[PDB]
Amino acid sequence: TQRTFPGCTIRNTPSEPIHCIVWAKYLFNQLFGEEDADQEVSPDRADPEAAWEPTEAEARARASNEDGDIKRISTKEWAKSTGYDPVKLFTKLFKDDIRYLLTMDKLWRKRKPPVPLDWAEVQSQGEETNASDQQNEPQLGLKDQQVLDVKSYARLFSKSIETLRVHLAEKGDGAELIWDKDDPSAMDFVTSAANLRMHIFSMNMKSRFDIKSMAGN
Template sequence: MVTLQLVGSLRKELADSLSTCRLLVVGAGGIGCELLKNVVLTGFKNIEVIDLDIIDVSNLNRQFLFQKKHVGKSKAQVAKESVLQFCPTANITAYHDSIMNPDYNVEFFRNFMLVMNALDNRAARNHVNRMCLAADIPLIESGTAGYLGQVTVIKKGLTECYECQPKPTQKTFPGCTIRNTPSEPIHCIVWAKYLFNQLFGEEDADQEVSPDTADPELSWNPADTETRATASDQDGDIKRVSTKAWARSTGYDPVKLFNKLFKDDIQYLLTMDKLWKKRKAPLPLDWPEHQKLTCPQGVTGMGLKDQRVFGVAGYCQLFSRSVETLHSMLADKGDGAEEWIWMGNCDDPPAMDFVTAAANLRMYIFSMNMKSRFDIKSMAGNIIPAIATTNAVIAGLIVLEALKILSGDVEQCRTGKFDSRNGELFSKLM
């Protein structure tokens, strides 16, 4: 282990600096777990770690300070306890809190000689960046995205800050595309996430899933009014009430929901004939027809279940089962139901089943190739799978940059980018 070798090879002055340095580690997740292990084995003694999250089962495959018995507990506190087991002489303080809490102000940051970021969101990174600049404390910023990782040092008056370079913004899609004319799988996945919120969470007017009659492509003629009214009357006796109100009126009947979402609403879209002059028209689904098929019909892909793509019948059945499960869970939540909202947490199996089934059924309707649960999970949560190897290498690079700073060689710090697919490391002077 590199860090074990470093402890015995550091010159006395640097070793003394490590033992007296007050260090703040922000984040105890994928990078943070590797980093905390590294810093104590390198010789850091006075460490404070802060993380808002609790441990989830999905963390256990790469955040090696945690075990199954720790699920549901504070990441920061358990990380502290785990590290102290193999380095009991370390002085570690853990905060189960958000670094953006006003208590962690400029004066708080001035207590440290060095700050290390192991965060996974931009808002917190921006905050720590500003606090370190205001306190004039060196910050080592890091991040990983699958096989790729990066480390950079931020020092006031010497380097660019975290916010100096523009960051890519999350892509958004027009509401009329989501509701009327999806052309890519991601459009159907976003629609399914919206539907989850409308049915089981907090309703949002900006996340409507019913056909959009205000689509700018339509430009209805007065003569079309009768056609639209007729379509509405034939829409399974569905009045234009909120999606959740209508679902409640049916007792969350899976078949009625299916018919509204994948048959009646699609038939309504077909009356908007101007949308389909240059596009392939959608194909309404019929529940009885697909129930005649067996679930394995059309299964493609090998390996784990999450990596397979099932036929329409399979997703019909998955949709029905997930609606029943979620309705039962919703009833159990009682008054707290309004707080249940899709927040990108794809580790709730019933919610992921629902989004997978609904998205795939809509893809089929609009003539797209359906996706595996694994693919939809990645896209639904805007997730790039975490790679333990990348986290470990990046955590090691953070410590190496810290040693340069404490040695007074901050000018020799580098911005490093690593690709764990081929072990390639690219670095340049700041």
């Protein structure tokens, strides 16, 4: 049978490319689909090195039957409030979240820590030649098998959010869109998000076709 993907390694350190893709799958659901508690995309505030373990039975001076919001974080709320802004979302998960995750030094004692990426820094590519965004790397073969650059996946991620937002709006309020592998927008989203997440951990990027085959599996 298929192997289960623990939320810990998904939200924290994904040493496997497939994990970055699974993370993106949950990201889509937690933004335009079903909102879960454990299958969240935001960094846990109840991290063993941050607050509690958290072992059975809380350890605080408050009502256990009336929790404030230690385990009910909803990224969908923030996304809805920002009107699904590509920049805000990008600078959140790929710039602020991993920055907060870096606080957990106990996670980086052997594995290379993630590097935060800002929307402005990715647009003003300094690592490589900031040439034509249209097409700079000449390749041959399947166009969907051509691994794009960080700029490409960044703008692609932004574009997918646009089409997905209006798609949800077309359905109305209180609607939930299920992720699919045949929808260009949904696929572009998961492909870009995964590539960005893996790029932050210094992991080799993957093509859309390659990810499409494993994202849907």
